[PDB]
Amino acid sequence: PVEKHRLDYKPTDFLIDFVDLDFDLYDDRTKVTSTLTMHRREQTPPTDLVLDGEDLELESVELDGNALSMHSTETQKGDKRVYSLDVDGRLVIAADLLPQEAEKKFKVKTVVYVRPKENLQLMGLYKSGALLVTQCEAEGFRRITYFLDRPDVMSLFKVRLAADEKACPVLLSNGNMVESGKVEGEKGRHFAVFEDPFQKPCYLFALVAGDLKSISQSFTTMSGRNVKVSIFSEPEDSSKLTWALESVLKSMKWDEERFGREYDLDVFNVVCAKDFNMGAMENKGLNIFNAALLLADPSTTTDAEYQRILNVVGHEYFHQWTGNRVTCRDWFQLTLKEGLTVFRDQLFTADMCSAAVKRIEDVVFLRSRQFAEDSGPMAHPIRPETYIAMDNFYTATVYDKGAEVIRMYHTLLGEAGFRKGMDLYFKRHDGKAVTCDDFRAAMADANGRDLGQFERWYLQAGTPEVTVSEAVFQPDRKKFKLTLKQRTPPTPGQVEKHPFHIPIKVGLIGKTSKKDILSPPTKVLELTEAEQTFELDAAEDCVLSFLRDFSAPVKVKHEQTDEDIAFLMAHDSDDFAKWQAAHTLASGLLKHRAEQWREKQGEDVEFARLPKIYVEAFKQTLLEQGRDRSIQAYTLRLPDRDGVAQEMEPIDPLALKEATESVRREVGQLLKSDLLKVYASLSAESRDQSEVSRRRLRNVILYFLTGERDKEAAALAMNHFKSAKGMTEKYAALSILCDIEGPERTAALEQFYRDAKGDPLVLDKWFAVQALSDVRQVTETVKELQKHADFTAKNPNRLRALIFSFTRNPQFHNKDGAGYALLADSVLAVDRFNPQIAARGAGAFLQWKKYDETRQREMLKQLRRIANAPGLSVDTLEIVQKALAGAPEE
Ligand SMILES: [Zn+2]
Numbered sequence: 001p002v003e004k005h006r007l008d009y010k011p012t013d014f015l016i017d018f019v020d021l022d023f024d025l026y027d028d029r030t031k032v033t034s035t036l037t038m039h040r041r042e043q044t045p046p047t048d049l050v051l052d053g054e055d056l057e058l059e060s061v062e063l064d065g066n067a068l069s070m071h072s073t074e075t076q077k078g079d080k081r082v083y084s085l086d087v088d089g090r091l092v093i094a095a096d097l098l099p100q101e102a103e104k105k106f107k108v109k110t111v112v113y114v115r116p117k118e119n120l121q122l123m124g125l126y127k128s129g130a131l132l133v134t135q136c137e138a139e140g141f142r143r144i145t146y147f148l149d150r151p152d153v154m155s156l157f158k159v160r161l162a163a164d165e166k167a168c169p170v171l172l173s174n175g176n177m178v179e180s181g182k183v184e185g186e187k188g189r190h191f192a193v194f195e196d197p198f199q200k201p202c203y204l205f206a207l208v209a210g211d212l213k214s215i216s217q218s219f220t221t222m223s224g225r226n227v228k229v230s231i232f233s234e235p236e237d238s239s240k241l242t243w244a245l246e247s248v249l250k251s252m253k254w255d256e257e258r259f260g261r262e263y264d265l266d267v268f269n270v271v272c273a274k275d276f277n278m279g280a281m282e283n284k285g286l287n288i289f290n291a292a293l294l295l296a297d298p299s300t301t302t303d304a305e306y307q308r309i310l311n312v313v314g315h316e317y318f319h320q321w322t323g324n325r326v327t328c329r330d331w332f333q334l335t336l337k338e339g340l341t342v343f344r345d346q347l348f349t350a351d352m353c354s355a356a357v358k359r360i361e362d363v364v365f366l367r368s369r370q371f372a373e374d375s376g377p378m379a380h381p382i383r384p385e386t387y388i389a390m391d392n393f394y395t396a397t398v399y400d401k402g403a404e405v406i407r408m409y410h411t412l413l414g415e416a417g418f419r420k421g422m423d424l425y426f427k428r429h430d431g432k433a434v435t436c437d438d439f440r441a442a443m444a445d446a447n448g449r450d451l452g453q454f455e456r457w458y459l460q461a462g463t464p465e466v467t468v469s470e471a472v473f474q475p476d477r478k479k480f481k482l483t484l485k486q487r488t489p490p491t492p493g494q495v496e497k498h499p500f501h502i503p504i505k506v507g508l509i510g511k512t513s514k515k516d517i518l519s520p521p522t523k524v525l526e527l528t529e530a531e532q533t534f535e536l537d538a539a540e541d542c543v544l545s546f547l548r549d550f551s552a553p554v555k556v557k558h559e560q561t562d563e564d565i566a567f568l569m570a571h572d573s574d575d576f577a578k579w580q581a582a583h584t585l586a587s588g589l590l591k592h593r594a595e596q597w598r599e600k601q602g603e604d605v606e607f608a609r610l611p612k613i614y615v616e617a618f619k620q621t622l623l624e625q626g627r628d629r630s631i632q633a634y635t636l637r638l639p640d641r642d643g644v645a646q647e648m649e650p651i652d653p654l655a656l657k658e659a660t661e662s663v664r665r666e667v668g669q670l671l672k673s674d675l676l677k678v679y680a681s682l683s684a685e686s687r688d689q690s691e692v693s694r695r696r697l698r699n700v701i702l703y704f705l706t707g708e709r710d711k712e713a714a715a716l717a718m719n720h721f722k723s724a725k726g727m728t729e730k731y732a733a734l735s736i737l738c739d740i741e742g743p744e745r746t747a748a749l750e751q752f753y754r755d756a757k758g759d760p761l762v763l764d765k766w767f768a769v770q771a772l773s774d775v776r777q778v779t780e781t782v783k784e785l786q787k788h789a790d791f792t793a794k795n796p797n798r799l800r801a802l803i804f805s806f807t808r809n810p811q812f813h814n815k816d817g818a819g820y821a822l823l824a825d826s827v828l829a830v831d832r833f834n835p836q837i838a839a840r841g842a843g844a845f846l847q848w849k850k851y852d853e854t855r856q857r858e859m860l861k862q863l864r865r866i867a868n869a870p871g872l873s874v875d876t877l878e879i880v881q882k883a884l885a886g887a888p889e890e
């Protein structure tokens, strides 16, 4: 297809009033009988009807009960009762056959066949284990039957499903079940009819058929309505659903208290799917989850995966209002529901777990994955202007930066002002398909606030850079002068970047008071120009606390002495800025040691001793009593390597890895006695946040106690591995052991495989922990694991567990190019059956320009090999075309 543009939107020529679907479900060939009740838009001349349709085996076309034949050269001579198929497979009916009056309704009935077992794209109807499941977002419903496959077309649905009674005892679709019984002529088959009373776009359609067990629990809304919440899964996993069920109940209660949102259906169903591209999908009343985001068990699920399940479960329920009842006018507005819903699950996770812990996790993920995207060839604003394949723009920018943009609304307007904007947003657009500007206008109108410049967050890509050009205390005036500058580098298709509306939370820590001296302690500064000076009231000499709570998704250039950083590490009040001060000091040490290693390529690299400021602060955090142990663990943990690499030019993952290990080993020697004392204090599975924090700090201290990677380190990690009562401490010890070549690593990996007992999720970790190992010939191990009996590229979770994890290994960038070729060979094979996963796999080649010339030539070679592959998908073609946009021709 050709490139699509945001400003080319136009309402549809025709409307869809009713959808009558009949499914004759078989694993090899499913018949889909569909009747669409349509009419032309008012005040519009007659025009041809064009319906989306992809990979359908068409049997018959019927217009108002009259059969139409396939247009051919023989039908041209005389037959006018014909239909046509365009070059893309869309169903075309000439305007002469349709009613002349616009309001006159007509019926288009089609019989098509699809092949679920051959549907390896996992879009539309396909087989997943013992289940027949669906996935339609964004444009997958056209792979089931003909439709106007766009989110601004809504209609009422009536769905009938017929299937084998033994293989598919449970049949599910959107809405309420109105009929169930046996198939009349065919013995052994049964059916069910589902009617959705509320109109919905086609991407929210879903159907499930297979052998399912369920747990359930009632929920009473604030109006008194009772909603039956049920979690479905295959029989073998039906005892691992309580954590997901309890998460739905918390999400429904939280949305009522925090935003006044009330569920409107009698049933809320969640079905687990073992073969799923996304993490979960918000199909109206019939959510479908990836198994890794639903199933939970103490012996298989880590604390982080437990929290991720709670977060995604809430995310999918929050889509019922921000996504389903108020939906998108077009796919350029994807961040209207994704950015707003991610922000909603971030507030939810913060209230359910720890606010500071969640904020630190979100910022670290943003400044690694999203910052790389925003500085690369695929950089796009949260509301893109153009796209080729819409599946390529379900990105960290649209999701996670979009949430940071929503959070900036909350910062500028306050909680009560943000709530008033939400109420007006839901009141105006309930049951409609709207845009980003509608949400921004709701926030503006409800608060009397001008948000015209704020739209630049939606229009301009790239990470803004905020420089602290001057920050000096003025004792004569009792003022603190703060001068700030902002600039944003060019991104593909947009060189000039106009100033953003940047809210910057600041604070001052008095040098005498050792606490906040501002009242209120945090002040929201509105940086709206390219350069601006602010004057804060400071009674005494102070130290600046800049960008508290990460109030804007920007880079910060702020020169601080190690003494002022140590002052903030000990006396700052903002939880993020307190951690940011420690993260800033450790990042600079990591970055400098990596540049020394990068200068000599590891040939005689001598590191200066770690400064006492860093070690004493590390020791104080380690020995501290009474504080939150999760904040303790995240402060002591070394900075994420992908985050530090985004500040380097060029990026050298091997130099950054050696820099990380050298710091890990030096602090392990300097504070070995204190580390061993705290480690023994954290011994002796509960889901309580107190026990999660204890295990989190215990695993971090083990990392600092095993840096030498000698026989003593392997023995300590092996005991941690064997004595673990859950997956959290077991997987952490295994991950540490896999960097230590020896018998302890092989024994742990062999035992880990057998202890899985065929569990696909535990086997994913077994593949991933090997792909991320810092061992020699880790590439050859990954290449060999592709032949393993339990490896199949057709399952996205298993493919990502091995291949995607390997792309995050620093040895993936080995200068011999063996790692790049491995990914390219994988992307080529996967693209022939699952374009979505292959396009995301090829994304690891996007930042080729940021690496050294040797790695540039190797990555450019694989990028061109993929781009020149015959039959390459539209999805993967767009990704590598963008990557090669700034590359030499030929
Ligand atoms: Zn989603």
Ligand SMILES: [Zn+2]
Binding pocket: 315, 319, 337, 338, 341
């Ligand atoms: Zn979402």
